[PDB]
Design an enzyme around this catalytic site. Structure first.
Site, short mmCIF file in Angstrom:
data_model
loop_
_atom_site.label_atom_id
_atom_site.label_comp_id
_atom_site.label_asym_id
_atom_site.label_seq_id
_atom_site.Cartn_x
_atom_site.Cartn_y
_atom_site.Cartn_z
N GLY A 57 35.17 7.65 1.47
CA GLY A 57 34.34 8.73 0.95
C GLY A 57 35.17 9.96 0.67
O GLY A 57 36.31 9.86 0.25
N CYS A 252 12.17 6.19 1.82
CA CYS A 252 13.16 5.56 2.69
C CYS A 252 13.05 6.06 4.13
O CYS A 252 13.26 5.29 5.07
CB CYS A 252 14.58 5.81 2.16
SG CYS A 252 15.04 4.76 0.76
#
EC number: 2.1.1.79
Length: 270
Positions: A57, A252
């Site tokens: 990342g 979610c």
């Protein structure tokens, strides 16, 4: 979706994964740090060891490892921007510890490593090559090598239980549909699947830590942050994308609140 869009709601480290509120009073950023530490604190890292961050990342994990565990570090990413970023951060490193970033996939890495860490990114679901993955984890780790896998998992058919919802094969299948098609909208590995794929490539799942509560709040913090920047968001993308995320983030968060969606860190000690 520009990286700028996500920067509107992610914390400064741009961590697009479950934060770890070790303390209820932690900020999204502190929780992301703790999450990273939670992961790292499980590898038994020793000064001089080389750590592999699969899916580094924006590099927060790597840097944290060098800082608190004084180890060399190799990071992999399929993001030009993330590599660029970490590469710049790493330039002119006086530190007596090697720091390397690679724009390659884990399936293309072939180096002796002492410990492996893999913290997935949210919307990046595609857990269908886990078997080959451990084979590689095994084929690279020392005889006592350790690897930590932080991933979102789904409920195994024979794994559910005691939630207060139907126990039929029809309900399970429906929820499986909702989970794979809408929230989160991808195929998720089940806890058994990981434990099995690992126990069949030279590994032994020592622990399975769930951060289910934390993700509900992480997603809660991402949506609030995004709403506060609705203007910029609609300006970088559009009102359609903005709304899609607000409801995808909301949806979610709920899937976790019922448990058909989970997020676990799997200490894979071999």
């Amino acid at each position: 979706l520009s990286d700028d869009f996500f920067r509107l709601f992610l914390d400064p480290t741009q961590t697009y994964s479950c934060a770890y509120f070790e303390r209820d009073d932690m900020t999204l950023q502190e929780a992301q740090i703790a999450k990273i530490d939670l992961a790292l604190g499980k590898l038994g890292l020793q000064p001089g060891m080389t750590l592999l961050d699969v899916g580094c990342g924006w590099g927060a994990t790597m840097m944290r490892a060098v800082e608190k565990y004084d180890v060399n570090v190799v990071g992999l990413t399929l993001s030009k921007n993330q590599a660029n970023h970490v590469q710049q951060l790493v330039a002119n490193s006086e530190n007596l510890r090697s720091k390397r970033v690679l724009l390659a996939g884990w399936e293309q890495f072939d180096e002796p490593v002492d410990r492996i860490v893999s913290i997935g990114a949210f919307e990046h679901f595609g857990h269908e090559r886990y078997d080959a993955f451990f084979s590689l984890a095994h084929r690279l780790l020392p005889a006592d090598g350790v690897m930590l896998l932080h991933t979102i998992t789904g409920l195994h058919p024979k794994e559910i239980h005691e939630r207060g919802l139907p126990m039929s094969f029809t309900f399970a299948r429906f929820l499986k549909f909702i989970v794979t098609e809408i929230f989160p909208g991808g195929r998720l590995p089940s806890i058994p699947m990981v434990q099995e794929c690992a126990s069949a490539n030279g590994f032994t799942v020592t622990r399975v830590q769930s951060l289910q509560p934390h993700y509900a709040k992480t997603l809660d913090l991402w949506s609030a942050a995004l709403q506060a920047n609705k203007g910029q968001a609609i300006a970088l993308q559009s009102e359609e994308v903005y709304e899609r995320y607000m409801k995808y983030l909301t949806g979610c968060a709920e899937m976790f609140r019922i448990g058909y969606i989970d997020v676990n860190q799997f200490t894979c000690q071999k």
